[PDB]
Amino acid sequence: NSPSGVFTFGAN
Amino acid sequence: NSPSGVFTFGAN
Amino acid sequence: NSPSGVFTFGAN
Amino acid sequence: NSPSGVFTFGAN
Amino acid sequence: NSPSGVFTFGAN
Amino acid sequence: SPSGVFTFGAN
Amino acid sequence: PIVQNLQGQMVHQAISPRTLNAWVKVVEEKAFSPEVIPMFSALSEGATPQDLNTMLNTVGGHQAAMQMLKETINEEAAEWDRLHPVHAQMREPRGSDIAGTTSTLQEQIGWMTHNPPIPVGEIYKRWIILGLNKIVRMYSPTSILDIRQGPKEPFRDYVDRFYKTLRAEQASQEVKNWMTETLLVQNANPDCKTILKALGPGATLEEMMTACQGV
Amino acid sequence: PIVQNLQGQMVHQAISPRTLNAWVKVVEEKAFSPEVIPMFSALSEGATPQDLNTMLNTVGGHQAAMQMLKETINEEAAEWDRLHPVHQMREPRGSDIAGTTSTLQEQIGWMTHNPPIPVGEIYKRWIILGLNKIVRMYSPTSILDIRQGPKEPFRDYVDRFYKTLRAEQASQEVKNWMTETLLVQNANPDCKTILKALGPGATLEEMMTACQGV
Amino acid sequence: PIVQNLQGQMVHQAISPRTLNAWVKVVEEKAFSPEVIPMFSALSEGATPQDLNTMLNTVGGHQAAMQMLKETINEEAAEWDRLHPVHMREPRGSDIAGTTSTLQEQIGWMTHNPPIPVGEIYKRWIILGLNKIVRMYSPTSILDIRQGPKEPFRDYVDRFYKTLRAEQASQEVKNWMTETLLVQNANPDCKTILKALGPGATLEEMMTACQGV
Amino acid sequence: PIVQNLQGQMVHQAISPRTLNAWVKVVEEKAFSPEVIPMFSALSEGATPQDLNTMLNTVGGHQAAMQMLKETINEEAAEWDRLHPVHQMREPRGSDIAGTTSTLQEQIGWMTHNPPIPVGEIYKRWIILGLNKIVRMYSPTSILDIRQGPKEPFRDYVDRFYKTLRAEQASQEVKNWMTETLLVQNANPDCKTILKALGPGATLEEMMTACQGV
Amino acid sequence: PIVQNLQGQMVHQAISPRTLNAWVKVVEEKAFSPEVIPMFSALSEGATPQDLNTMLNTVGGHQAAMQMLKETINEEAAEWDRLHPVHQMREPRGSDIAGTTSTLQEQIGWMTHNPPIPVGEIYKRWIILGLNKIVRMYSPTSILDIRQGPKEPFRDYVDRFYKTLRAEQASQEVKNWMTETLLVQNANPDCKTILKALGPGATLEEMMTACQGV
Amino acid sequence: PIVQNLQGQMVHQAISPRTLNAWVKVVEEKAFSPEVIPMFSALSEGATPQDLNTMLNTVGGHQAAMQMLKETINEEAAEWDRLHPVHQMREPRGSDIAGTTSTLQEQIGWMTHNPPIPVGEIYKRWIILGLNKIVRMYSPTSILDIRQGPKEPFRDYVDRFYKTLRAEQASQEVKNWMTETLLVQNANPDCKTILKALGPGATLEEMMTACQGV
């Protein structure tokens, strides 16, 4: 299960 | 009522 | 008496 | 013994 | 007497 | 005369 | 931003470190005082949606506000998808493409440099500012109806408090006219309030302040 | 500002972050002391109406003064619409010069036409006229109330007098009368006799050197 | 970064001193708070692997995090080696990490037709390491975030969503947390004011309801 | 400053925000200590009269000194008008060189004609002539009042002496007489006996090394 | 650095005031913590030996380290004189690469030859070999001295361990042995219990994930 | 500095505001610590005599030192006048190299002649000879009074020693004697026995690593 990332806006 | 915007000068 | 402006030097 | 250098990433 | 200027070095 | 203060290079 | 490179291609220009450190400093210090929106709009100038997303992603604090902004951008993007039905020389952007979630940077620059341009940077900047407007209204510490002058307070410092609150609360211009004509007088202290009524209805803010200047 | 692109097209260069932060710090800290107008004019070189509006919108404090500035800009725009009734691009109305009606591409159009229609410079003048009124109003003490204290150095009184005289910004004939007849007369009773011993033709450098020990 | 010289050739523009000083200050002050990753991704735009390696080498503190990053980059490089079997010389994973590749190979790959964008691929492997680091450096779990008996709801939601951003669960877990932990962990004054709205209320409705409490 | 555009045209480069903030801090903090004149000249290289007037107008305090500067510029302009009668680009009168009558366009015209009339560097001379008088006057002490305290280090006294000697800016033969006679005669007794035991007319390096132990 | 001039000739680009100020701050604040060497290498990209010497000569503190660096550079230069016997421009001797017997014009000549002799990069290798020795010696503790406190979070102990391991800069076999064996062996009894329970195959992410609350 | 213009002419580039703020801060803070000379030489890269004079004139404090520098420049110029008698431009007298009797156009002429007459570098050497004398004099401690404290880390004493040895700048045979004999002799009683055990063949890395635990 991997972390989903921190970019609230845009393409991530 | 939607906010009218903060710009004192120019048309937003 | 309109204000004459604050430029001490130059073209005013 | 000669030091290997301090770069963690790349070619040193 | 007129002031001689404050440039220690060069042509004043 | 003083020898100059550069450690590296040609002074 | 976008720049024509030495080969004459329209190529991305990275949003500079100076611009990002300015924007971060602005948001973290001024805490959605209304100046944040014109300063965003200035630092934003020429931004692609990837650049706008870079600015908004770099904000560290106010994560409740950044979620209200994200929810507003989602509302605007869904409204775009409603107002512009999908088509049955280039792709036509959906709301998620203008918000820069489903578009590549080369699509974004494609649209922004098309003929006619489809200015997804300016469209998305409008949706961001529509979110920030709501946030700046919410982060106002006072309503204008609870801005009033103290018995010893200068009319200049009271007017500064009144118009800063009026700018944040950002009612319609007809209501700003009503508030500046009626409340600014009505909420002045008793020594100023009589002077302000003596000028009658037509007085400018300059006339009001220069009349109250010694009180 | 406006810049020639490498393709030979006229392009708006964004007003830089350091210019905006300099302007903000100037307005927020110096609170319409007279220096703000020269510093504004220096920072706003080559500015479009969009750049001028950006500068003025980025100010956060003094919103009373910013509303006096808006009301002055609207007044000067109405005077423009009175002097220039409407008739290869379209001519700017007063609201175009203020950058409300006009697009940035119209502003670049006018500012790079041949001959140019200098909407940026015209709007800068309207802004400076509003700032003139604000700077005059934000002056803390009128010149008639400037006088020299006991044991106040004459140079420090002259600094107060001419800073006040710069903020009040009367005509040069009035500034002449004030420097001739108030500066001497409002000096303290010790300096005042030295100054009058110089006679009415005295130059400020002569007044300051004569009073320097007192 | 990559630029074209006056001779019309693709040439390395050195990552500037000011960009490095900004990155160093960002990492050392913000200590893998989540805003470090978008700030990295913004400072490293157009970066070659040599530039990315310069940024990661210049970080002085947090050497535990930098080893988690290095071992993640090694894991991603080994998976690239498998996802792209060995056949401009095609890059192995160590080449994209900039360990076995010269700068001229990196610029060759990043400017080929089609390009092999080793700078972007490596930036993805770095950000995949930074994600795991940011998740781990999250100082408290979202289950621990609770509103104080006199804390404004606006400050509590700021703490909640900053923690939620760092801990970075999948979207359905965020849905459940923002719907139900955020309500449940509010203080006894706000908790009823929230429950009055019904469970479907948006964050702006919650923040305007609790505005004075 | 003046820059050649891409079209080869002579174009104004605006005096930058950081140059102005540097100049403002220089004047406000150093208060016509003598470094202000070399720093003015160095910040103002290649400046048009528009740029020089921008620097002078942006100065906030010290308005007494700015009037002494304005009086000097007016006197120098009147002298120019006396020596260069009015008769290509129109011949500049003194008020053109001060940048009052001339626009920025005529200033760049003169500064880029062949031969150029270097109105920016001429005006920078008139400004520095005004600043010389100001820096002389803002000197807090006559050199006759600079003397060494009991157990004050000789290097610190020499620093005070030559900073004062630089500010009051006598002619070089007078500076020679002062640095021969006053520099020794105003030393404290411990240093003064040493400096008189040295051969008369010792170099400053010999004087300072001899008195380093006192 | 080196730049192609407008004439197309190879020309020196001077190392900027901001780059030097950054380097001077880096050395004098960070006291040969290991990030000083990647920061040096980044600040000196494209540097000529004259640039690399302006950097090293502007370092004011740590003159003990700068002597160790000079001694190392002299050992490398003597080795270069040995491995490259003496016989476009002349082939550079070790003292030429160090910039002690070569002009900046000779350095640019070698660095822009075809093929180049990149005396800037060769010399920067000698500087970095000296800085490697200095950073090793300035390490405050051997890696064998790094041990966990009974109340110390495992993350802080790992940070201390790997910063020391980075400064000690042993060979990669030895770093592998240390990170596998010593990092566990030097943990406190609770963390050491958890870390043995993971077995030796755990990566640092697992080690920190398991010990996160201990 | 000097550049080639778009028209192909040799043209001045003024020393920037940022370079002057750097130089001024360097001199005012570091007070002729030896790093002032490398930092001068770095900021001065490519300077004409006008740029060099601009740097020196902008220094504010230490007016003792600035007169000792002026006296050194004057005697160096007199030696130039003696070794190079007067008989393309005129060949420069020493006053022309110092930029007192020469225009900026003469200076750029000489610095761009073929072969060049490098008056900027010649003058920069005379300045650095004066600064060498000043840096030697402003050294607060003589090396003979640098002693290690009873509890002082040897690395701090070595740093104090080599910083003094750099400032006082004896000849290399004397620096060799001092680093060999005094560094041992002035070490404290613990380090001194440690250092004796190394014998006369003790490099600085050996001395410092031997004392590293004390």
Residue numbers in the entry:
A (entry chain I), B (entry chain J), C (entry chain K), D (entry chain H), E (entry chain L): 1409 to 1420
F (entry chain G): 1410 to 1420
G (entry chain C): 1 to 88, 95 to 221
H (entry chain D), J (entry chain E), K (entry chain A), L (entry chain F): 1 to 87, 95 to 221
I (entry chain B): 1 to 87, 96 to 221
Task: Quote the study on this structure.
We proceeded to classify the Nup153(1407-1429) in bound hexamers according to tilt/twist and position relative to pentamers to generate context-specific structures exactly for the apo capsid. This analysis yielded structures at resolutions from 3.1 to 3.7 Å. Inspection of these resulting densities revealed that the Nup153-bound hexamers adopt the high-tilt conformation at all tilt angles, suggesting that Nup153 binding stabilizes the switch in the high-tilt conformation even at low tilt angles. In contrast, we do not detect any density corresponding to peptides bound to pentamers, though in all three cases, peptide density is visible in the binding pocket of the hexamers immediately adjacent to the pentamers. We posit that the increase in observed Nup153(1407-1429) occupancy at higher tilts correlates with the arrangement of the R143/Q176 tilt switch in the apo form, because the high-tilt conformation is favorable for Nup153(1407-1429) binding.
pmcThe mature HIV-1 capsid is a conical, fullerene shell that encompasses the viral genome. Here, we present structures at 2.6 to 3.5 Å resolution of CA hexamers and pentamers within in vitro assembled conical CA-IP6 polyhedra from multiple lattice contexts differing in local curvature and geometry, alone or in the presence of Nup153-, CPSF6-, or Sec24C-derived peptides.
